[PDB]
Design a protein around this nucleic acid. Sequence first.
DNA 1: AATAATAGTTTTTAGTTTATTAG
DNA 2: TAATAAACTAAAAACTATTATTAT
Lengths: 98, 23, 488, 215
Amino acid sequence: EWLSSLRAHVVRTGIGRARAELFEKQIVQHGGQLCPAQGPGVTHIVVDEGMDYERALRLLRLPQLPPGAQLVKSAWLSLCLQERRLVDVAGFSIFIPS
Amino acid sequence: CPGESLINPGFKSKKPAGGVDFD
Amino acid sequence: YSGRDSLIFLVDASKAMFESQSEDELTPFDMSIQCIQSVYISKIISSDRDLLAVVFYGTEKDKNSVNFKNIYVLQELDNPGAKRILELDQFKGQQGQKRFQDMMGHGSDYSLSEVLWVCANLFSDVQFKMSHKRIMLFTNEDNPHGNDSAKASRARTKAGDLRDTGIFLDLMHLKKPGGFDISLFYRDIISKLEDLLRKVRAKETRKRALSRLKLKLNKDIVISVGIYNLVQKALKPPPIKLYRETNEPVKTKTRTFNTSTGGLLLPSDTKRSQIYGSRQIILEKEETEELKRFDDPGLMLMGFKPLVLLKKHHYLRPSLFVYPEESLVIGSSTLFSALLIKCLEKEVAALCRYTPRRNIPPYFVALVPQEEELDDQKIQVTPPGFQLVFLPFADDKRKMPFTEKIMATPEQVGKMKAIVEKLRFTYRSDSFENPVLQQHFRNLEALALDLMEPEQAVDLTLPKVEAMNKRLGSLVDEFKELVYPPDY
Amino acid sequence: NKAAVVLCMDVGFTMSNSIPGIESPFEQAKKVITMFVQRQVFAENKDEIALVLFGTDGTDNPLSGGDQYQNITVHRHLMLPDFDLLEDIESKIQPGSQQADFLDALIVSMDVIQHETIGKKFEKRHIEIFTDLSSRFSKSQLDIIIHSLKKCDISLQFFLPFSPLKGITEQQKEGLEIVKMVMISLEGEDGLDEIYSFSESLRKLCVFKKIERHS
DNA sequence: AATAATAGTTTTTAGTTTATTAG
DNA sequence: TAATAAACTAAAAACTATTATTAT
């Protein structure tokens, strides 16, 4: 019950159907605020793991991600979920070359 | 040798269907 | 060894085939067009790997790469596709014929040396082994007259050269079928057109030969035979993947997902079990695979069992045709020539343990000597070899109640003997194709050109016996000496 | 549907072992019944099992028949088998201290099965002999059992330490005669086709042919 | 810098779902 | 109607393509 601090947004595509719906379910169960990755009010823009910042621009149809958010793997989040705690975002950020 | 399929020599020229016969 | 079959078809252009054959019937051009639809469909439904090219001669224009006069090609050596069928089928009838003639050529003379020239040069370009090669012709000339005897003689020399090369010539009557009006002097340079037309559908063939099986009759002697799968179903054309409008297949990331991580099941995280009572008995795919190991892939011969003692009540998988061979062990077919010569003690079946694949249990099989029924026309019927019937286990049985309840009166046997004797069938094996598969084919050709459906028919599996009953005589109803009708 | 089957097995000390080459009726009976039971519980047939023992010290059955029910001790009530009970049987079922009678356990079985016809409607029932006939037994109670089977018609399977036919001892001879009369009266030619052994049941399933898989 | 193991697309095959006859 | 044609996913081997790896 700790995703409330994450104004998160789990992607439907790429992020597996069952994996995705489980991630939004865990977010809403933990009190996590779900908000789109198209504008401000996002603490963490979480997107697919293998896709980079340019792919973030292309999939989101943007030149840049909306501000105020951080980009990180859902594997770290799942680890925190299983352990029922929260771990640092370092070592799991999705790769941002631009 | 005769009796071989024209499309695939070495395999037989099979006669088409004739249905069931009543004697 | 697989090989290939290169087939090329030539048509003159002299209005001798653009003509309607002085009849409302199909033109020689039109009947050749229907013949070529038949050939293209047959090639597609069969192994379509063979290449077919389209070349025409005796024409005003030239598009052959060599650009010799009166030669106009349309199609390269390609497997006949849908677009090929459409592009050749768009030129038929009077309107198609005239548009084709103005885009190809309305007719001119023939240069035989030039066409044999270009055919040799083109057939040089084949990049694969060629199991067969044939050229079929459909022309109305009885013998070469327009060309000088010099061209006829040099064409004869090149014809002998190509006949020695392996390629052969075929022709059919055009002026009048039957008798003899064509090839009076082509008799030297050397119905049935209906067979070239649409006669045979849903064709396929195999030129393979299944692997060498090793007879483990005992530890000392293991011999080499060639197994052969001779019977199996012909299958459904695969639903290969595609897209709504971009028309492009899909890959797969099919993998089972785990509630723990956003990742998938690891090969460890996935773990086998089974609910037996109060147990989730826990195993792995590895353990289940390791369980089924009994002995080596082959036939671990238990021993012969006199076929004079045999039964027909039991039935299993369709039989397998084993054949004598000498592949990797000598003296094999030396002793294989035996056991097919006597029907008093060498017809004896072989109760054998047979493992077909590595890591497979032994399966009970029995041997039948299938003597080469070499048909009188040489067509070796029931080829020389072995019919192998796989033998049952103690789970091929679901119990049945006894039905020996009645042995009826001789009046009924007499009347129904009269009924059934009026019908006997010569048992034509090829008499019924697959109506379901052929209907799927028809759906495919409906989606091919423009049809809602091109052919609306059954493969004759429908009961014609609604007319057989009167053929047999409606007496079947008056031979119901039965007081109460069963169907009420 | 209700295959009401019980276990009236013979246990002892000189019969829990035997001469080499002839497996003990006790151990062989245990292993063959466990093989058939494991097949059944992997098939999960609708059957409940009651276990009662003769040949062990004392008599712990619900009724001892005024000591006529020799060394009859009951263990399991009529219930669905599980793996813990079968492993308990395969572990602790041990050589008995004496030898006793079997028709006592059989009649206890018919009594409890007829009494426990509730819950699951009683249907076709199969029972199996477990006796090596090398003990000291009587041949008089055939009348009670014949009256019971002629009023119940229970299918029976015979077991023995031998599948030659001449190796039976004199007591084995008299036991064979009495059970032969019983099963020719019960099944007739089927009863002859139901004559088998513990060691035979080690390799034969046709001993339990009384149940069939109908289409 | 000479042969001699293997290799590697193609083709059935068969214990898994999949809908439709199933205590 | 709580099994069953019929399919249906995975799946070795088969018939070739080769291919190297000890052959000067």
